[PDB]
C-alpha cells in the first residue's frame, strides 16, 4: 500500500493531517564502508538517496524525520540495501495528540517496501563527461560571452538533449536489507530552538533507546524473517547489562554486538560504515588525522569509542543494527503522491530550509514553516502537501 | 619639551584620519557610480534579469515569505544610490534602494518604490523611514492597513503575518525592535552590498547548462 495509506492507519480517526515526503535525486556515491585495496570483492557502485518527511496539523508542522537509503551493488545480481535513520524530532506544537512512535515506525515500513530498483533507474553520477558548456568552471564573463556566441549563431541560447548521460542499474527485488541507527537524545535535531517550547517532550538516553528499540522490534516481527540478525550495543555498558534490556524485546534473536562483525578483515576502518553526522564516522575520521586507522581493530574501536569524552560525559546512547530479508518482497515504486523529488540539490535544500531553518521557540515558526512549504510547492512546483484522514480508534 | 611637540602633532593626525577615510571612501563611491550606470544600461536590456537574480541568490529567499515570490518575479529594476555623493550631510554608509514592479492583472499594481536607509547616532545603527507601496490584493487578509485592530487577538495574528512579507519590509524603521519586519537592516545591507553589486555574478550562475547547478 501507499505512504498515504500507512500514515492514516496510525493517526487518530476523523482527524486531518498533511505531510511532506521529500526525496533527493539518487546520487552515485562512494562506498558506505571504506574498502581495502587488496580485496576480492569491492563495491561496483553505491547509490545514495535521502528521504525527508514532515507532518503537519492545522497549519503547523510538528514532526520530521530524515533517513538515508543506501543501495550497494557488488555485481550482476549481488546487491544489498541499507536504511540509515539519521534524525527524528518534534517541536511540541501539535494541538492534538499522536504516537510519534507509530508514525516513525510506519514511515520506515513504507521505506522498507520500496523496490530497491527504484533508486536504480536514473542515478546522478559523481563525475560526468564537442565542448561549449557552462558549468561551475565558468567565470561569469566566460558565461556571458558563451551566451553571446550562442545567440549570434543559434536562434536562442539553449542546446541539444538524445541526452542519456545519467546512470541506470538493476538488482533482485528481494535483497539483504540492513537498518542502522545510533540513538543519542538532544534538545532538537530538525527544529531549531524548539527546546525552548514548554509543551515539547524530550526523551532521555535510556528513554530514547527503549523508544527506538520498540519500533525496530515491531519491524523485526512484522517486516522481517524469523532468522533476521538484530544487534544492540550500548557504549559504556556491560554485555550482561544489555542482555537485560534485550529480555524486554519481543523479537527472539536480538543479541549483543553489531552487524559489522565479519571475521574477514578484522580491522575497524574496513568494517565501520560511514554515515552523515554519525559518531562512528566521527571517531573514524578522528583516527585518520591522528593516523591510527590501520592500527585499531574492530574490537578495539568499540572499546575506545567509549572513552574520549563524548560518550564518557553524555547520556545513554545505543547502536542498533538489523540485517536479514523482509517477509514480503519489497516492490513498490512510490507514486507522485508518495514522494516529491526536487529538480536539484538546490531546490531540495531550499524546501527543506523552510522547516529545519525556522526558529521554533514559538508557535510562529511552526506556522511559518507550514505556509511557506505549501505556498512554495504550489507556486514553484505546482503541487501541494498530501491530506490525511486519520483512521485509528482510541 | 620636544615631547609636548610630538604629542600635540599626533593628536592632529588622530582628528585627521577620521576625515581622511571619509575621503578614500567617497573616491570609491565616485569611481563606482558611472560603472553601475553603464552596467545598468545593459542590464535593462536583459529580459527577466532581476527575476532571475533574486530566485538564484540563495540567501535572499530566507528573509521573505515563499508567496512573495509571485510579486518578486515582477521586479524590472533595482537601483542602489549612495547618498554621500549628493551632499556631505550623509554617512558614507548611507544609501537608497529603488525597485520597479511591473504589476499583475487584477492583483498587484505597477509601481516604483525608493526606501531610504541611513545611519543614526547613539557606533550608529542603520535606520529607515516607512514608504508607501501597493500591497497585493491577495494579501488583503494580512494587510496592516486593512486590519481594524492590531492589538486584538486575531488582529495581532494577521499583522505579524504581514510583517514577514517583503511588503512589510517597506515599513521597517530599525527603531521598534521585535515589532517590525525581521532583520530589515540585514536585508537592506544584502541589497546594497551583495545583490546589487554582484547581480551579474548570480545571473551567470543561473545560466548553467544541465539542471543540476
Amino acid at each position: 500500500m501507499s505512504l498515504n495509506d500507512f500514515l492514516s492507519s496510525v493517526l487518530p480517526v476523523s482527524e486531518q493531517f498533511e505531510y511532506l515526503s521529500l526525496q533527493s535525486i539518487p546520487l552515485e556515491t562512494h562506498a558506505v564502508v571504506t574498502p581495502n585495496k587488496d580485496d576480492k570483492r569491492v563495491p561496483k557502485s553505491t547509490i545514495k538517496t535521502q528521504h525527508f518527511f514532515s507532518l503537519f496539523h492545522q497549519g503547523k508542522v510538528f514532526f520530521s524525520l530524515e533517513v538515508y537509503v543506501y543501495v550497494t551493488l557488488w555485481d550482476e545480481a549481488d546487491a544489498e540495501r541499507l536504511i540509515f535513520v539519521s534524525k527524528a524530532d518534534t517541536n511540541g506544537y501539535c494541538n492534538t495528540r499522536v504516537s510519534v512512535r507509530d508514525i516513525t515506525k510506519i514511515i520506515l515500513e513504507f521505506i522498507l517496501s520500496i523496490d530497491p530498483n527504484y533508486y536504480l533507474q536514473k542515478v546522478k553520477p559523481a563525475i560526468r563527461s564537442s565542448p561549449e558548456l557552462i558549468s561551475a568552471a565558468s567565470t561569469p564573463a566566460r558565461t556571458l560571452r558563451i551566451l553571446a556566441r550562442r545567440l549570434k549563431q543559434s536562434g536562442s541560447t539553449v542546446l541539444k538533449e538524445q541526452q542519456d548521460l545519467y546512470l541506470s542499474f538493476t538488482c533482485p527485488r528481494e535483497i539483504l536489507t540492513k537498518i542502522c541507527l545510533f540513538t543519542r537524545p538532544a534538545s532538537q535535531y530538525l527544529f531549531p530552538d524548539s527546546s525552548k517550547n514548554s509543551k515539547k517532550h524530550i526523551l532521555n538516553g535510556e528513554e530514547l533507546m527503549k523508544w527506538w528499540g520498540f519500533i525496530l522490534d515491531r519491524l523485526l516481527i512484522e517486516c522481517f524473517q524469523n532468522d533476521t540478525q538484530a544487534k544492540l550495543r550500548i557504549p559504556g555498558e556491560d554485555p550482561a547489562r544489555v542482555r537485560s534490556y534485550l529480555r524486554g524485546m519481543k523479537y527472539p534473536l536480538w543479541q549483543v554486538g553489531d552487524i559489522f562483525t565479519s571475521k574477514e578483515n578484522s580491522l575497524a576502518v574496513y568494517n565501520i560504515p560511514l554515515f552523515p553526522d554519525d559518531p562512528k564516522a566521527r571517531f573514524i575520521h578522528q583516527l585518520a588525522e591522528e593516523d591510527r586507522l590501520l592500527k585499531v581493530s574492530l574490537s578495539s574501536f568499540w572499546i575506545e569509542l567509549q572513552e574520549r569524552q563524548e560518550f564518557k560525559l553524555s547520556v545513554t546512547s545505543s547502536v542498533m543494527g538489523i540485517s536479514g530479508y523482509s517477509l514480503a518482497t519489497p516492490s513498490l515504486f512510490p507514486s507522485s503522491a508518495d514522494v516529491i523529488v526536487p529538480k536539484s540539490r538546490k531546490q531540495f535544500r531550499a524546501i527543506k530550509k523552510y522547516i529545519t531553518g525556522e526558529e521554533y521557540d514559538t508557535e510562529e515558526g511552526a506556522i511559518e514553516a507550514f505556509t511557506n512549504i505549501r505556498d512554495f510547492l504550489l507556486l514553484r512546483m505546482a503541487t501541494n502537501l498530501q491530506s490525511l484522514t486519520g483512521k485509528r480508534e482510541h | 619639551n620636544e615631547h609636548a611637540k610630538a604629542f600635540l602633532g599626533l593628536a592632529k593626525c588622530e582628528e585627521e584620519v577620521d576625515a581622511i577615510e571619509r575621503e578614500v571612501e567617497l573616491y570609491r563611491l565616485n569611481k563606482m557610480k558611472p560603472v553601475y550606470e553603464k552596467r545598468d544600461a545593459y542590464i535593462d536590456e536583459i529580459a527577466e534579469f532581476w527575476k532571475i537574480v533574486l530566485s538564484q541568490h540563495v540567501s535572499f529567499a530566507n528573509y521573505i515569505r515563499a508567496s512573495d515570490f509571485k510579486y518578486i518575479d515582477t521586479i524590472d529594476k533595482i537601483k542602489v544610490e549612495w547618498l554621500a555623493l549628493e551632499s556631505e550631510m550623509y554617512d558614507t554608509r548611507d544609501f537608497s534602494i529603488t525597485f520597479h514592479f511591473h504589476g499583475i492583472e487584477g492583483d498587484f499594481k505597477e509601481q516604483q518604490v525608493t526606501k531610504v536607509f541611513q545611519i543614526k547616532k547613539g557606533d550608529g545603527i542603520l535606520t529607515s523611514e516607512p514608504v508607501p507601496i501597493e500591497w497585493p490584493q491577495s494579501y488583503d487578509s494580512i494587510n496592516p492597513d486593512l486590519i481594524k485592530d492590531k492589538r486584538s487577538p486575531e488582529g495581532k495574528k494577521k499583522y505579524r503575518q504581514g510583517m514577514k512579507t517583503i511588503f512589510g519590509w517597506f515599513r521597517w524603521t530599525g527603531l521598534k525592535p521585535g515589532k517590525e519586519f525581521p532583520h530589515g537592516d540585514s536585508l537592506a545591507s544584502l541589497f546594497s552590498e551583495e545583490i546589487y553589486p554582484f547581480c551579474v555574478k548570480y545571473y551567470a550562475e543561473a545560466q548553467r547548462d544541465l539542471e543540476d547547478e
Binding site: 531553518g357 525556522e358 526558529e359 | 528573509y63 525581521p182 532583520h183 540585514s186
Partner: peptide, 4 residues
C-alpha cells in the same frame, strides 16, 4: 543576522 539570523536568516529565518
Amino acid at each position: 543576522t539570523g536568516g529565518k
